Amino acid sequence: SSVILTNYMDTQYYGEIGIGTPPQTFKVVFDTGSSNVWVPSSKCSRLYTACVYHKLFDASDSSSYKHNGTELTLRYSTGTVSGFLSQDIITVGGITVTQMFGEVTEMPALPFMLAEFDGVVGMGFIEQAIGRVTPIFDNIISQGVLKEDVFSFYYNRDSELGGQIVLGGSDPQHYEGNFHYINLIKTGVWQIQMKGVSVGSSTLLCEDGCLALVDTGASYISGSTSSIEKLMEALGAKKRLFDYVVKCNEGPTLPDISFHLGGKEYTLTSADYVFQESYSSKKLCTLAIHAMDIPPPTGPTWALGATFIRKFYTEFDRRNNRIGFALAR
Ligand SMILES: CCc1nc(N)nc(N)c1-c1ccc2ccc[n+](CCCOC)c2c1
C-alpha cells in the first residue's frame, strides 16, 4: 500500500487518512520522529484560531467511535499539542486499522496556524509513544498483510507528485542504485550513528562520531546550536532568529556538505540546501539547515529531515532495525 503526499513549500509533506464512520478526512504528516496519532478535535475551543483553520474530528458523527478520554500532551521541537485519547477506524492507503489516537483540544496559533496539514501520524516505535499507545504501523503489521515489515519515504522537490510513502516495501520507481543500510543505535528510535560531518574538504564536525535522527516529520537537517554555529561560520552564513541566511548571490558558491553514515558519504550541494529564490545580492536566502537542540534521552543529536530525504529515498526497516538510503529518483 502506498500513500500520495502533497509537498507544501518544500517544508511540509502530508497525505490523507480517513477516521471514523463515515470517514472524516484529514491531512497528516507521516512522522518517523514521533509515535502517536492525532488530529484536531471538534472539542477544541474556537479561541484556538488553529482549530478554526483545520479539519476537526467530531466523535459524535462517527458510529465506530470508542471513547477513552485519557489526557495526553505531545511535545515536538517546534510546538506542543494537548488533548485526549479516542479510538476509531483509520484508513491509510486502502488499509483499514482500528487505532487509538489523540483528539487535540489545545493547538497553539504559533506554529499551527502555519501548518498546511491538520494532524500527525507517528511512524516511530511504541517505546516512544506517549501514553504507551500502540503505534499505527504496529497495528497494521499485526494484520499480517504487508509483504514486508518496512515502510519507505520519497519526498519530491517542489514543482508545478509531492511525495510518496510506501507501507510494506519500496517503490523502485523513485530511487536508483541499491540501498545502503545502517543499523539503529537501538530499536525504539529511528536514530543511527553518524561517523562525521564535513563542509567542503575538511571533516571539521562530528569527529569521534555523533547521533543522527532520521526524521520524516522534520523540515530541515538540524544540529546542536554549537555544531551549527561552526558549520554556518564555515559557510559564512549570518544567523537570524529562526534561521541562517546568505546573500542570495552567494548561494550557488556555497560548498558541499557531507554526512558520513554507515561507511558511505551522503553529499548535499548548495542547490540541495539553500532556498535559492533569487540571485540578487540585495536579498537574503535562507538555508534548509537549522540549529535545533534536541534534549535527552534522544538528544543531543543531529536530525536528518526533508532536506536530506529529498535527495535520498529512505526505507525504514522494522524487521531488521535498520535504515536504508538510496539515490532518490
Ligand atoms: C509532524 C510533527 C512534527 N514531528 C517532528 N518529528 N518534529 C516536528 N517539529 C513536528 C512539527 C510540529 C509542528 C509543525 C508546524 C508547522 C510545520 N512543521 C514542519 C512539518 C514537516 O513536514 C515534513 C511542523 C512540524
Q: Is the CB of 120 under 6 A from ligand 1?
A: yes
Q: Is the CB of 298 under 6 A from ligand 1?
A: no
Q: Mind listing the domains of the chain with CATH numbers?
A: 1-170 (2.40.70.10), 171-328 (2.40.70.10)
**Which residue's alpha carbon is nearest to atom 1 within ligand 1?**
217
Alpha carbons 103 and 126: distance in angstroms, whole number: 19
Q: Is the CB of 34 under 6 A from ligand 1?
A: yes
Q: Is the CB of 7 under 6 A from ligand 1?
A: no
CB 103, CB 72: distance < 8 Å: no
Name the experimental technique. X-ray
Q: 6, 7, 73, 78: which to mutate for ligand 1, most atoms within 8 A of CB?
A: 78
Of 223, 203, 225, 226, the C-alpha closest to 211 is 223
Active site residues: 31, 215
Which DSSP symbol is given to 36?
-
Atom from ligand 1 closest to the CA of residue 215: 6
CB 306, CB 10: distance < 8 Å: yes
**Which residue's alpha carbon is nearest to atom 21 within ligand 1?**
12
Q: Is the CB of 92 under 6 A from ligand 1?
A: no
Q: Is the CB of 191 under 6 A from ligand 1?
A: no
- DSSP-assigned beta bridge partners for residue 78: none
CB 177, CB 326: distance < 8 Å: yes
Q: Rg of the chain's alpha carbons, rounded to an integer? A: 20
Q: Which helix (H) or strand (E) holds 311?
A: none
Tell me the DSSP string of 58-117. -GGG-TT-EEEEEEEEEEETTEEEEEEEEEEEEEETTEEEEEEEEEEEE--HHHHTT-SS
- The alpha carbon of 14 and the centre of ligand 1 are apart by a number of angstroms equal to 10
Look at strands 79-92 and 221-223 and give their pairing: unpaired
Residue identified by cell 477506524 is 89
Q: Is the CB of 114 under 6 A from ligand 1?
A: yes
The amino acid at residue 132 is R
Q: 116, 219, 243: which to mutate for ligand 1, most atoms within 8 A of CB?
A: 219
Question: In the chain, which residue ranges form alpha helices assigned H by DSSP?
Answer: 49-52, 109-112, 136-141, 225-235, 270-273, 306-309
- The alpha carbon of 219 and the centre of ligand 1 are apart by a number of angstroms equal to 7
Helix-then-strand count for the chain, H and E = 6, 23
**Which residue's alpha carbon is nearest to atom 2 within ligand 1?**
217
Q: What is the largest CA-CA distance in the chain?
A: 61
Alpha carbons 225 and 193: distance in angstroms, whole number: 19
